[PDB]
Structure 1
Amino acid sequence: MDLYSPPFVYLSVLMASKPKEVTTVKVKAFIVTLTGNLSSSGGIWSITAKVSDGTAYLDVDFVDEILTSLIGFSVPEMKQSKKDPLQYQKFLEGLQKCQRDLIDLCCLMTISFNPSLSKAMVLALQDVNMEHLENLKKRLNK
């Protein structure tokens, strides 16, 4: 099994391939646990987690862009919202939506795997579609 085989590959297969360099793969995964709080340090959002695809556990960080899109607010927008109660109330709403979305997250994750640090960055999230179903049928020779 190829690391480019659609619709997704497996972490256990990635690790067994013993990659020397940082490697992009797409896996279907959920968050087993978060491993830190949401952080805005550095001027950007980050949060660490352990995900599983059913074949392995993987420490990951999520990119700012993903967390901005779940919350509805960038770090600058969050800071600006502290300047006005009505806007800050909207950020709190966005934060609850994000917390919930991380709890329920189960999707295709494009991840950048650093084999030296045994961890990865999640670059993008994608929901499954009928093409994914068709690719899985084709891979199972059906």
Structure 2
Amino acid sequence: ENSINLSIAMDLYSPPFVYLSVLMASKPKEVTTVKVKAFIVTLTGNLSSSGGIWSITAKVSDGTAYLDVDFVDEILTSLIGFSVPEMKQSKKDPLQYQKFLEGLQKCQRDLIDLCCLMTISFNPSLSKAMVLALQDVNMEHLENLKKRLNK
């Protein structure tokens, strides 16, 4: 696609974050990537090691809509502290596998407590969304928000 509705540019891309309801109302035709402040309402699938990478599905909300998402392997590896290959190597060593089990629990807690900026790629053709990055809110975000509200 070689055109964009210019009247939605701020709606999709204004810092510090935008809204899922607004994205969906725009009826995107191509893969669209936005940043939202969101938390996980519930996990919707098991943590999988299929393909030699971590995956999990969850339903998130930004206060305006629900969205079912996948998380990139790198996020899950960072939260657990083990990649899939590392987990598989650890299994024969009780002390190493124990570190993995501790990481699993850490990941579980981290996903329960998650409330941050999520960069999300939404593919309207496949009705799929993938979380590409997570970022903690910071004072620049606060100032961005104040500026947007002219405060």
TM range (shorter): over 0.9
1:16 aligned partner: 25
> Which stretch of structure 1 is more off in the superposition, 84-93 or 109-118?
109-118
Using the alignment, how far apart are the partners of 2:28 and 2:126 within structure 1? 12
TM superposition shift of 1:119? 2.9
TM superposition shift of 1:115? 1.1
Unaligned runs of 5+ in 1: none
Using the alignment, how far apart are the partners of 1:138 and 1:11 within structure 2? 21
Measured on the aligned residues, the alpha-carbon RMSD in Å equals: 0.8
TM superposition shift of 1:83? 1.6
1:109 to 108, 118, 122: 118
Report if aligned partners of 2:37, 2:62 keep a CA contact under 8 Å in 1: yes
Report if aligned partners of 1:61, 1:120 keep a CA contact under 8 Å in 2: yes
For 1:52-106, what per-residue CA distance to the aligned partner results, in whole angstroms no more than 9, with x for missing partners? Answer: 0000000100010000000000000000010201100000000000000001111
TM superposition shift of 1:135? 0.2
TM superposition shift of 1:51? 0.3
For 1:31-58, what per-residue CA distance to the aligned partner results, in whole angstroms no more than 9, with x for missing partners? Answer: 0010011000110000001000000000
Report if aligned partners of 1:112, 1:122 keep a CA contact under 8 Å in 2: yes
Report if aligned partners of 2:11, 2:23 keep a CA contact under 8 Å in 1: no
1:69 aligns with 2:78: yes
Unaligned runs of 5+ in 2: 1-9
> Which stretch of structure 1 is more off in the superposition, 129-138 or 115-124?
115-124
Q: Give the 3-state SS of the residue equivalent to 2:37 in structure 1.
A: strand
Using the alignment, how far apart are the partners of 1:86 and 1:78 within structure 2? 12
TM superposition shift of 1:10? 0.3
Using the alignment, how far apart are the partners of 2:47 and 2:27 within structure 1? 31
Percent of matched pairs sharing the same residue: 100
Paired residue total: 142
Report if aligned partners of 1:34, 1:49 keep a CA contact under 8 Å in 2: yes
Q: Give the 3-state SS of the residue equivalent to 1:14 in structure 2.
A: helix
TM superposition shift of 1:18? 1.0
Q: Give the 4+ runs in structure 1 shifted more than 3 A.
A: none
For 1:107-129, what per-residue CA distance to the aligned partner results, in whole angstroms no more than 9, with x for missing partners? Answer: 00000001123331000000000
TM superposition shift of 1:17? 1.1
